[PDB]
Symmetry: C2
Amino acid sequence: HHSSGLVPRGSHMPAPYWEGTAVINGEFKELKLTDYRGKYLVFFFYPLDFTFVCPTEIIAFGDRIEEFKSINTEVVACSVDSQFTHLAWINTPRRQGGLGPIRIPLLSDLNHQISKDYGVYLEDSGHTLRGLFIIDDKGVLRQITLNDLPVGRSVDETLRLVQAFQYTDKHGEVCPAGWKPG
Amino acid sequence: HSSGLVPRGSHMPAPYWEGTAVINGEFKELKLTDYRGKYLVFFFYPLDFTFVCPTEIIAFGDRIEEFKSINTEVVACSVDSQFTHLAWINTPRRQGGLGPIRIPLLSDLNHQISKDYGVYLEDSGHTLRGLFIIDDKGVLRQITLNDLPVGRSVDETLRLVQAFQYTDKHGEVCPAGWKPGSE
């Protein structure tokens, strides 16, 4: 076992509160989970900036961010790097391993509290897993996907699944024919 | 709180579990390692004999050959005893039962499995409704938490396992405009 902030309560799993400094539009801004209340939030942890592994998901979320906003959804990516490294990464061209200009916030988890709360921190290596969390408009966790490679299709799947959760939120559910409660 | 979901290396191994299941109406011992080499869809649901239809389990059972064809198995688990699971299977669907079913029902009577999986609710004494997809190497790939029975979660699960498997086989390529730095 280890400790984490992912505690089942009631009949749901509330997303743990977080706050920290993010880079938005090239500037530092304090961000918190509660800033996204009333919207779905895709919260994407990735190991580190400036590695030799392409940031496929962040680039694709950035490219498609207007599609998510169109369905009441925001996207925030997070790693244990400082906000100064996030800014430098954005300010480095993609042809040189950088992220380049990006339209989603990069949140800093420098003191590791957020990733420990989300249960994705690796104690030995000092960074997180690659993990995509979908949080609904009530702040409840709906899905976590863990990939060890950068997977571009996970952006498509995220758009599809958010829309599916929202459809379910609104329409409820129907039982199979032939089953009746006792 | 405490759970078994511990990141290790560069991923999240699915916590070991073992317990007694009902399989084709018989009690059998089952454990996570029995599924090595196969994807495992491990579905927790709160309780047998409730007034909430068991839509997922019914659909997984009807479609189980589609999962088996892609080297995937499905196990459902609640905190109920194996005796309760067998009685539930033996109760007709039109009376709130599960009826005959082609997927194992795992008992987590002492709550060890659901605590290890981080889905146990201490106050009520049962689990959340949650679907875990575990790959052929025993690594956790996805967790989905639905409070309502969602039938399409079966179709989605099939599609996601297929996608995870496609990635396993083919790997991924970088966006065209991106190149790494180097030492």
